[PDB]
Amino acid sequence: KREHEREVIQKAIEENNNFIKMAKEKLAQKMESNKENREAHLAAMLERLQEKDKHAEEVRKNKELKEEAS
Amino acid sequence: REIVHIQAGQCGNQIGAKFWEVISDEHGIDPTGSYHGDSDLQLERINVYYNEATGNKYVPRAILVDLEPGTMDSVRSGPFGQIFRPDNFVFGQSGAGNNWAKGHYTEGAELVDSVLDVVRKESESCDCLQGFQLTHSLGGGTGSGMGTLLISKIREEYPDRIMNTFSVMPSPKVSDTVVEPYNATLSVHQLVENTDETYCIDNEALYDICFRTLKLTTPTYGDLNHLVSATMSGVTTCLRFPGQLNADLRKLAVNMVPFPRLHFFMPGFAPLTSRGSQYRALTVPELTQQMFDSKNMMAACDPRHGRYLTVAAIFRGRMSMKEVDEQMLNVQNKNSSYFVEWIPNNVKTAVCDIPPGLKMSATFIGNSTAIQELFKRISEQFTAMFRRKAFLHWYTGEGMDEMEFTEAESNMNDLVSEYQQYQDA
Numbered sequence: 001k002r003e004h005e006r007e008v009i010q011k012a013i014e015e016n017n018n019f020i021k022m023a024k025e026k027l028a029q030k031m032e033s034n035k036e037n038r039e040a041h042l043a044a045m046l047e048r049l050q051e052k053d054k055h056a057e058e059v060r061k062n063k064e065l066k067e068e069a070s
Numbered sequence: 071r072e073i074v075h076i077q078a079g080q081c082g083n084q085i086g087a088k089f090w091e092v093i094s095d096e097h098g099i100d101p102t103g104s105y106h107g108d109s110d111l112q113l114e115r116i117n118v119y120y121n122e123a124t125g126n127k128y129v130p131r132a133i134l135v136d137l138e139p140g141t142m143d144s145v146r147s148g149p150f151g152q153i154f155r156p157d158n159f160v161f162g163q164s165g166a167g168n169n170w171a172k173g174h175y176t177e178g179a180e181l182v183d184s185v186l187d188v189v190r191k192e193s194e195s196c197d198c199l200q201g202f203q204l205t206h207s208l209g210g211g212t213g214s215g216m217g218t219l220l221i222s223k224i225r226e227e228y229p230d231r232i233m234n235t236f237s238v239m240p241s242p243k244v245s246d247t248v249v250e251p252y253n254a255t256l257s258v259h260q261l262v263e264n265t266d267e268t269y270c271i272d273n274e275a276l277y278d279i280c281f282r283t284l285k286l287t288t289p290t291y292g293d294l295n296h297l298v299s300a301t302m303s304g305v306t307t308c309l310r311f312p313g314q315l316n317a318d319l320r321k322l323a324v325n326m327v328p329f330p331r332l333h334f335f336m337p338g339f340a341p342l343t344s345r346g347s348q349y350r351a352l353t354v355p356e357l358t359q360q361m362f363d364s365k366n367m368m369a370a371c372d373p374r375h376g377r378y379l380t381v382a383a384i385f386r387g388r389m390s391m392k393e394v395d396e397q398m399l400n401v402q403n404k405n406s407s408y409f410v411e412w413i414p415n416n417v418k419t420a421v422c423d424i425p426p427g428l429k430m431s432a433t434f435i436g437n438s439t440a441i442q443e444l445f446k447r448i449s450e451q452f453t454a455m456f457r458r459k460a461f462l463h464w465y466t467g468e469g470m471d472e473m474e475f476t477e478a479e480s481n482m483n484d485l486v487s488e489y490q491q492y493q494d495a
């Protein structure tokens with residue numbers, strides 16, 4: 001019976017500690033994966049805007065070509 | 071022949087404090103521990119419950135246990151609060167939240183060793199220890215969980231001694247929490263295995279007595295504790311005063327317990343007093359009829375629904391012994407069917423000249439098979455919740471497993487079937 005009394009209290013510790021452990025790791029994983037997702041959304045947004053600038057440089061150059069071949 | 075008294079939890083300490091106030095008065099001991107009595111027949115067996123200290127002071131051999139200081143601070147301030155040994159107050163700060171698992175496995179396990187150190191100290195100073203008596207409730211957490219934990223540890227250290235308890239059974243009529251059937255079932259499982267004798271004090275019976283008999287509509291714990299302390303006084307008279315019947319815990323157990331597991335007693339008392347009641351002195355025939363009546367039982371069981379295995383009656387005060395014997399013989403002859411025929415002379419009678427209080431009273435102690443009605447009521451309530459796993463998270467959250475509940479439920483159902491078997495014999 002003393003053997004079981006020690007198994008009960010150790011089971012309670014192992015469960016609370018393991019719960020605290022999992023929650024800590026899952027929260028850090030969520031905050032990290034969120035950071036990655038938000039930064040990816042901004043990176044794609046800026047990539048789209050940059051592709052638009054590259055196109056404006058190509059338009060200004062396309063005018064430079066037409067003016068010289070006039 | 072010393073008895074080590076232990077009181078645990080709110081209930082255990084409240085009924086325990088009253089028991090000490092009551093007997094201290096009976097033995098002529100004042101709150102300071104000094105003797106000022108008008109008879110010496112108060113000091114003859116005073117050593118059964120009191121130790122003798124330095125300036126001719128008598129100190130209760132009591133250990134006060136609780137996981138919350140509240141109730142024990144109330145005791146220390148009450149009338150006889152100064153009578154107890156200050157070192158014998160052993161208490162924690164985080165209570166038990168009416169959770170058996172907390173009292174037995176977590177909170178209680180942290181405090182238990184320090185209690186055992188006090189128990190051991192009180193035992194080492196015993197010329198010849200007969201055993202221990204624990205007061206507690208089975209519906210709470212400290213008295214229920216930690217109390218049965220203490221019983222288990224004490225038995226390991228003193229396997230050859232008697233373990234006696236005054237166990238207050240829970241009832242919806244006087245309830246503190248819905249998890250009382252869980253706590254009670256878990257405790258009864260411990261009691262069936264680790265006690266030699268348990269006095270079943272039912273809060274349902276104490277309530278019905280206060281309500282239906284005394285007409286105390288809206289009774290308080292103080293009202294229930296009035297009956298308890300009076301019954302506790304009566305059932306321990308044979309141990310505190312010079313006598314021949316059930317004079318010690320072992321002889322009481324030998325006379326009252328025919329089967330090891332069937333050691334749950336139904337106390338009874340007469341007259342049923344109400345705190346500050348009126349004028350008459352009950353004749354011996356009146357005392358006898360009342361103490362055997364279902365309405366005077368401290369356990370909510372109808373003795374007419376079962377049979378008595380053994381009975382111990384105690385009369386207190388100046389009365390005719392011839393009339394006592396005539397009345398005691400008459401109750402049995404008039405109800406011989408309710409006493410098992412296979413246990414000859416199973417009703418023993420004792421008389422004490424010193425009355426409680428009152429001019430004359432009678433205390434009944436019965437090992438009846440009808441006690442199964444108490445265990446059935448609890449088992450029904452326990453099953454109604456366990457079937458749907460209600461409130462189990464509070465217990466499993468402390469480390470306990472569902473298997474432990476299934477075993478406690480099963481052991482109590484076995485106890486009921488055993489009481490029924492001997493009722494049909």
Ligand SMILES: Nc1nc2c(ncn2[C@@H]2O[C@H](COP(=O)(O)OP(=O)(O)O)[C@@H](O)[C@H]2O)c(=O)[nH]1
Pocket residue numbers: 078079080081082084085166167168169207208209210211212213214238239240241244245246250273291294295298
């Ligand atoms: N007769 C009686 N029953 C009590 C008293 N206090 C609590 N109870 C009962 O005991 C149970 C609660 O246990 P309690 O002693 O309060 O809690 P613990 O501190 O966990 O042992 C319930 O079944 C209550 O009805 C009291 O002073 N007298």
Ligand SMILES: [Mg+2]
Pocket residue numbers: 078079080081082083205206207208210212213214
């Ligand atoms: Mg208690």
Ligand SMILES: [Mg+2]
Pocket residue numbers: 079081206207208209210211212213214215
């Ligand atoms: Mg309790």
